[PDB]
């Protein structure tokens, strides 16, 4: 799914 | 007159150690390998899963000299640990190389202690770069090799032909537990950025850029009429983020990192997911099919065995301005619910001595008495907790 | 300054692709590797055991571009298939060197895709040549290599230190399914000869010379007081064969083909099992300690399972000038004799349409009716047979 | 212009063989030619042990019949001899003491009876032992591919010189995982050269007990080195007792070459022939000590009784009697005098022997103990 | 016998 | 099919 | 056994 | 581990 940085 | 690796190895073989550890959870024993980064201070880098739940850590050198090592910093998100040898006496550390210049096909040498046999050396090649997906939440930008790697190589060294460390052997893809010619190791730059943070802070300054993304496959490439078939697909940028200040719009595709092309978004998350807070870097974007560069600067993200060393499942930090040791969130069944801890608990005292922060908190963890009395609060309620 | 394999692989890895197959049998999906043979046309050779019973076939390059590929030819006696990429755009082909120049000791680079990890390059040497016996009916003249090869490397290229294709990785020997240093590749010359046959005719013109025989061991050369301890021993020659036309006596030993020494009969059988009908070639012989050289030219060469798939033990063919499918011989308890096919039956018709030959028969077979009704005849009697 | 091992290998491969040996069983292994003329092939003992039939197949295919020469299962080395050799190719042996971790290796053998298979690797490590605490083990470890059937094969360096004999792999599954062990060539030299000259292995001992030296013992005994041999105790009348090796000493080197461990040191001299003079590097009380030594064994002394002649042809007087010996079963005691045996008088050890050379089923000895004249019985 | 990758 | 040595 | 070609 | 040599 979506990821974050 | 025969070509050989022995001239290089005799320089580097002292730098690699084997690591023997005893702990408990139910007492157990296990072993991996380590690499000397600073021969002066006694710094040995290893895998965090080698040193997880560790009461006593012993390091044995190439020549058989036994030493003692205390923990320094751990980072289970990337499985890099760092320990310091008690009484550093006449060591030799390994020099490192820039993994960003590694190419698939370069020759590699693995050094470790497989099965406690002692320092074993094995040869191979770079099989692939940017490998990930073996644990989605972890920051993994692995290198692949066909060099023989088994149980005990963990934390060992992976060097090039000039003897320079390029990676730390971490784990293998073995259906039976024995090397089938596929090994993974954490690149050097990742270990350098993580270790150099652990020397100053004993922790990892986890900085964020403020972007959402997913892996750009060939199917999505056609969807957005984007030529690049791999990279980072920007889903959204967060407000007040350096990424927003840099002027990144959703739907942009990231292709390069400081020039270095991107093998995948998962590699990109691990790359800058290790760079210390504030690290200025540039990016290769791609909006409307037009190449765009941008300069950036990581900012702060603001987030128990980090402090407890063995009793985990619950993240905890300082509270407010000198408000004590708050508990952020707890997982069930872990050693945190074994003592009586929930989310929102604030450790204000311990053994008749107040606790304003984690530095005041561990200031009594040092005392190590027979019995612990945690003066926590839940809501306006003040309670105590007993252990050991 | 370091030696490496990276500059050769950077020109060669775009040539190797990963393949994905969807099938049905209990529906299945398979994954493996492939090698671009022709750049413009999009010919991608792979293993036949990779792409059989495939409904959908998508090929992914090294950079991640997806394509759709159509089967073109298949040859399971040697395990080489060939597919063609739809809408080929910007591909890379591989130069194929002469595999007959390989020797035990040469260095090999194996390229493939184990476990869907991605393009994985591994290193090894030629362990041995001319190996066969895994499936004693198959045409196998395998190359043996200790290059790391696991599930998914199949259809991948085996190249020398110059990046020229020297073999297609096919199978491994693993009592645990993981690589233990034994891989097998079909020589590039057998692939070069079988790929060139699927380009022109879509299948293989399996040519026969016309000599029977068996392996030449060390015991038989003592009995025949022949010098050479390995080669092809001519047990007999078939009459009316081009080989018999050339002057080949029984009891003679074959030692070379086109000058190339012969490792074994099963190798020689596999070498010529690929060349098209009419290929001129030279042979070195040893009859009564005398060397004999002769040139030759192939001639052309039926189960009920060669017409049904699943119905063995009933050898059939056409009869006369369009007079039905005659049953020549039937074995007791075989999938045809269980329904009523006896030896001598003249298949006259089926489902109210006449059957004059194997061609008119296959006009309604491929019409796939639910239940089938043959109108064969047991001599003077007119009987009917039913299937499914 | 590419590199390759093929030139080196096409010189060496004729010198490595495949072996076929036959609750009846059938077995397969490998061997390496030591002598071109005599047809001697070295191989692992666990390949040709309990062998009724021994068929050797050369690199060209030529089959041969071989029979046993020597065996020593403590080191897992066995020597066979090809019967009626014709045009055989010996291998050139190198001194394994020149080996170094990181040198490239090449292994030759018959994995799963496939035929001669060549595999490449490096010296993973050296001096390894412990996999059978009672076997003589000083293995070269290598990452070269080695599986079931590679036993008895050749591990050679890049010049083709034989450095070791592939023996066993460390594998949880029975398939190579990059850990193969090979007995060093120098042990093969000392062992096979004994099986030819003596038929078996003349084992010598120094008469010292000892345990390994850990970093924990180095502290307690004020010793500097962290690995070696700790002399616990020396047996009297042993070479070391004679040589003046005292207890609590530490063996650092052997003949100049330093020692990696006691278990390696034990395996080295376990292959040296009896009487092999040598020199050792000791370390006692912080003083470097060198010592020379001479192995030993573990008139006509028959069955544990030392005897020599008495008087002028007055028979053979027994001189010592070890208890719990064949001599003890016969009852003979020290000081006993023989006059005759089996109705034949005995004057010296020659007349005794010519009745022992006659090898009878029972032995009746006409001795005299003290003042009495008695008979003793044997066999 | 053998395996087929 | 995985192992963290 | 035997094989044809 | 107290062997004899």
Author numbering:
A (entry chain Q), G (entry chain P), H (entry chain R): 471 to 475
B (entry chain E): 11 to 35, 82 to 359, 364 to 448
C (entry chain D): 11 to 35, 82 to 357, 362 to 448
D (entry chain F): 11 to 32, 82 to 357, 368 to 448
E (entry chain J), F (entry chain K): 460 to 464
Quoted passage from the original study:
First, DegP is an allosteric protease, whose activity is carefully regulated, and a hyperactive DegP variant kills bacteria. Second, because DegP is an inherently promiscuous protease that degrades misfolded proteins, over-activated DegP may destroy various proteins that mediate essential processes in the bacterial envelope, such as cell wall maintenance, membrane construction, or cell division. Previous report showed that substrate binding accompanies several allosteric behaviors of DegP: proteolytic activation, assembly of cage-like proteolytic chamber and positively cooperative binding of a substrate. DegP mainly degrades misfolded proteins, but its over-activation by the tripodal compounds triggers excessive degradation of newly synthesized proteins and leads to bacterial death.
We also tested the tripodal compound with the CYYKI arms (TMB_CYYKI). As expected, we obtained a similar biphasic curve with the maximal activation at around 10 µM, suggesting that this compound interacts with DegP more tightly than TMB_CYRKL (black circle). Alanine scanning of the peptide showed that the C-terminal isoleucine and two tyrosines are critical for the activation and tight binding of DegP. Denatured OmpA was degraded not by DegP alone, but by TMB_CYYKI-activated DegP, indicating that the compound induces degradation of a protein that is not efficiently recognized and degraded by DegP. By contrast, TMB_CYYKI functions as a permanent activator; it remained almost intact and still activated DegP after longer incubation times (1–4 h) with DegP. Overall DegP structures were almost identical to that of the dodecameric DegP with an active conformation (rmsd 0.697 Å and 0.986 Å, respectively, for 2309 Cα atoms in six DegP subunits). Additional electron density maps were found at positions where two degrons of 18–58 are present in the dodecamer model. Because CYRKL and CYYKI have hydrophobic C-terminal residues that can occupy both the S1 pocket of the active site and the hydrophobic pocket of PDZ1, we believe that these peptides are located in the two substrate-binding sites in the same fashion as two degrons of 18–58. Although the lack of electron density for the central benzene ring hampers determination of the binding mode, we suggest that only one arm of the tripodal compounds in the co-crystal structures binds to either substrate-binding sites of DegP, because the distances between two cysteine-Cα atoms in the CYYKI peptides of the crystal structure are too long to justify any of the three plausible modes for the bi- or tri-partite interactions. Taken together, the crystal structures suggest that the tripodal compounds mainly bind to the substrate-binding sites of DegP.
